[PDB]
Amino acid sequence: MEAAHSKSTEECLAYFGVSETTGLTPDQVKRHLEKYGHNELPAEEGKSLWELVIEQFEDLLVRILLLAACISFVLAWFEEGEETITAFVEPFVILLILIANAIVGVWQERNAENAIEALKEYEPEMGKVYRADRKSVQRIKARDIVPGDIVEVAVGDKVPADIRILSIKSTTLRVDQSILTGESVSVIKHTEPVPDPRAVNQDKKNMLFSGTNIAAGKALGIVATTGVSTEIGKIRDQMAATEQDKTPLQQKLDEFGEQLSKVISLICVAVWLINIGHFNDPVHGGSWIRGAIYYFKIAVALAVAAIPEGLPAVITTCLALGTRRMAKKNAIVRSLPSVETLGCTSVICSDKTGTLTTNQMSVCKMFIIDKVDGDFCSLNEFSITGSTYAPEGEVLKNDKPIRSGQFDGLVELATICALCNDSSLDFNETKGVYEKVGEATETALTTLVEKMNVFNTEVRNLSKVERANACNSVIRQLMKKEFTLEFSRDRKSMSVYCSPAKSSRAAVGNKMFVKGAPEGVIDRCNYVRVGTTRVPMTGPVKEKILSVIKEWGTGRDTLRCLALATRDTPPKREEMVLDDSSRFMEYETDLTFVGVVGMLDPPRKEVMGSIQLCRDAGIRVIMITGDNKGTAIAICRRIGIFGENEEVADRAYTGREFDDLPLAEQREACRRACCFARVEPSHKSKIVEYLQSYDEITAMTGDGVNDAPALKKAEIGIAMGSGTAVAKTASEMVLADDNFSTIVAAVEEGRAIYNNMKQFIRYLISSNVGEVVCIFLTAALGLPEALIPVQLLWVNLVTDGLPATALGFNPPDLDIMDRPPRSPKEPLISGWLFFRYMAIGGYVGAATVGAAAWWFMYAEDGPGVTYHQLTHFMQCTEDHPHFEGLDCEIFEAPEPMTMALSVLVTIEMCNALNSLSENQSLMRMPPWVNIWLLGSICLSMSLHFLILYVDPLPMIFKLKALDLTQWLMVLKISLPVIGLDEILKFIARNYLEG
């Protein structure tokens, strides 16, 4: 239906041929699904992986090498005849390291996308509908919604299709349609038609748009359009503009990437400038301009060598890996910074009901007044069996199954429960189990009244679907519901205004049925009901009422309590103004106390363990709830937030007690207290805000719309998969599992991703610095060139490639979740760690020149033996005073340069073995802890052996094969780097701080 906003409610119903309270017939649905198709959009896929591949070449550090390959290709036309084959291999050595890392990056990205799509599609989205099929509202898959059926929506829900609003059940209906219209604040909805058929979505104040959220209230509507015809569907098939952005740590590493790029660039020109006296040498033979091309070529090669190619890829890989690992644990990562931020988390704030607890509610205890005699007050307590939402159970009084209709107080208690209710119960035929519709608290009431057969309705001859709401429907026929004062968290109650059916109870008049937090409700009671009689509320009566609440609340069942009351003489219907909900409390005053229900809601089994694990990692857990302080404290003990016997006067507050504190004291109570109770949505974010003012990284966890503001304020917000769409929207991560443990797992992965980056930087800095100090040491000592441009590129390809990237697959350290969280103030590279880099770098540079010097000097079987004449090698042409009588060209020998290249490769493969952990010993964290690294090392080590022995290769790379005694020298000089960092790890672990 186009322009349904322009048509009236009557016109839309007649348009599809639907009774408002009935909905579509099964035949009407069959035809509509055939006519309109399913309520869904064309699925997203991942065929060609180019947008992926192209992104793989977008960073600065990668495009620097991309430029270097072009210069090497343009300079190939400048090469003449002789050594042409050597010049054309150069760009393929630069380009091969870039492709190898791109393959890993793209591969890891696809796996992450698939794991995400496997988790997002897993649980089908549901909708509430009225269909001729059933008397009560029924749950169906959102895709099975057709234009025509009557759909029901309420606070927290996601609007499933484009709806023409027919009836607003609350005093107001507010909607979060920022995803569409752009407007931040919730917008008020009405039922009046908007004449303009060309009016923009903002003006369609009587429509609900698919994929938006009910911020407030409850509504009945008729479906205008579904599928691709939806207002949000038109901009999904075309306007697929991404919300992509790089994380804080990504930007921190990219900032660090440019920092190195400049430093390398400076010590790169510092090679071309310290070798100006070689532009005219017998080695090249060329002119002053020709020799400058060669040392420019050394520079560009040293740049490529020093520049971390893998850095941009490895972080993106580690992030994609993190998203995949979370998807395996059933956690939807909505924002990329999620995992890395949870690594920093020092305080996890958490709502109780439905988050720390299962939200599987059932009334197991209730009471009404029995007898009031002056100073004496006694209660009629009762017990109820069944823990699920099944209308299967018994009402027990002194262990005996009783007829609820017997007690007049229970008749009224059931009446309130049934009438003052925005929820129902629906039987899932497929699963074979009764499922809640709306709020858990309220549905526990629904199933309570079905168990209480107050008017002795015949139920045993009804189908499972009919049995779900039978006795509730009976009560609904007794009183007409005029309107409801919705549940508000300032009041912590809800009210229903009812007139009689005009049959039996007709003689009396109007009533208001009230349900809420016992504290507030009982205070607004001036009377208590005894059977059908009424007596004044007194001190002794109130004290008795409250004492049993406290009993059930702080007991071992830690019951969630709710008081029930009626306004025997409500205000005139025309003397109540419904525009402002701040007036609702006064309409719910002069009440008569009827009774109290206590409902069990068991804590999630994984919660106690997770909190202890959080404690080990130095993370605090804070319960923030609107429920009673007593029960809240009792539950905190059950989940380990407080000890069983710990004193909590300093550490537990109500919202009122909190507000009574000066602002400075409130702030302080946040770093002290672990339980906040009878709180508000404003309080939850305020607590998070106070936590953040001590520069703590804070998480919020919740299910309810009351949690959305705090979830938005926290560094990372975690929603329950079984919670509201509103809370999911406010969040960076959804636990579709509802597994609280996944939060702790996400904390471990966030620390792992950071530590893997640290060891990646450890390896690339300490290694590449050594390659630089190798070239500078030869110039500083006056020794012949240790490497050529092509040889530098090979060192790069074989050391900076997969061996570096495989570090991103390191396992977590053995004490990763036993150390307090990392400070935000903490810099990327520690002062001690920057010395660590220079100590390893200095050694690998001195070892490379030392091995080349060894060949010229001590190497007996290796040709050319000299003493202290390497320093002055540019002399034998003009002046040979102490020269033995050997060749005056043995300084151009490939053998010492092959030793240098060989050591530089081998020592860095050894240096990679150090980068499994920061401070932990190599014996304690063995090399076989990362098999991916060992596979990469052996691939580099094998590839290096190919370049030496396969006939055309040593000629192209200007090398000569080593002796089995010369390889032992490489091993004798490289292996000690394991021991060197081992001493440095011993100092950092034992002497400094572990």
Ligand SMILES: CCCCCCCCCCCCCCCCCC(=O)OC[C@H](COP(=O)([O-])OCC[N+](C)(C)C)OC(=O)CCCCCCCCCCCCCCCCC
């Ligand atoms: C003119 C042409 C010149 C020819 C010269 C070409 C020589 C280059 C040789 C090989 C290129 C290397 C590409 C390897 C990319 C691997 C991508 C990948 O699977 O990543 C996920 C893999 C698998 O990780 P995962 O995360 O999916 O595994 C899950 C398990 N946990 C959770 C425990 C991690 O991760 C790797 O990136 C880790 C790094 C190790 C590298 C693996 C290589 C194995 C070693 C040798 C085999 C290479 C032969 C194959 C040749 C292919 C040629 C195209």
Ligand SMILES: CCCCCCCCCCCCCCCCCC(=O)OC[C@H](COP(=O)([O-])OCC[N+](C)(C)C)OC(=O)CCCCCCCCCCCCCCCCC
């Ligand atoms: C061009 C040739 C360069 C020659 C320069 C001569 C430098 C001297 C060389 C060796 C002597 C070593 C002794 C110095 C160590 C004392 C410094 C110190 O206090 O360190 C600990 C401090 C302590 O750091 P912290 O405050 O984080 O403390 C951590 C300590 N724990 C872990 C115990 C808590 O580390 C500093 O942060 C290091 C200074 C950062 C400098 C930035 C590095 C830039 C790198 C290269 C730039 C190139 C420079 C070119 C110079 C051009 C000049 C115009």
Ligand SMILES: Nc1ncnc2c1ncn2[C@@H]1O[C@H](COP(=O)(O)OP(=O)(O)O)[C@@H](O)[C@H]1O
């Ligand atoms: N639908 C409802 N009608 C009346 N009272 C309610 C309803 N839902 C909850 N309450 C009461 O209001 C209190 C505050 O609710 P809320 O702020 O959501 O905290 P929580 O549900 O976590 O206790 C609850 O503890 C409960 O006693």
Ligand code: ALF
């Ligand atoms: F479920 Al709560 F405060 F504990 F919203």
Ligand SMILES: [Ca+2]
């Ligand atoms: Ca490099």
Ligand SMILES: [Ca+2]
């Ligand atoms: Ca290197």
Ligand SMILES: [Mg+2]
């Ligand atoms: Mg909750």
Ligand SMILES: [Mg+2]
């Ligand atoms: Mg709640």
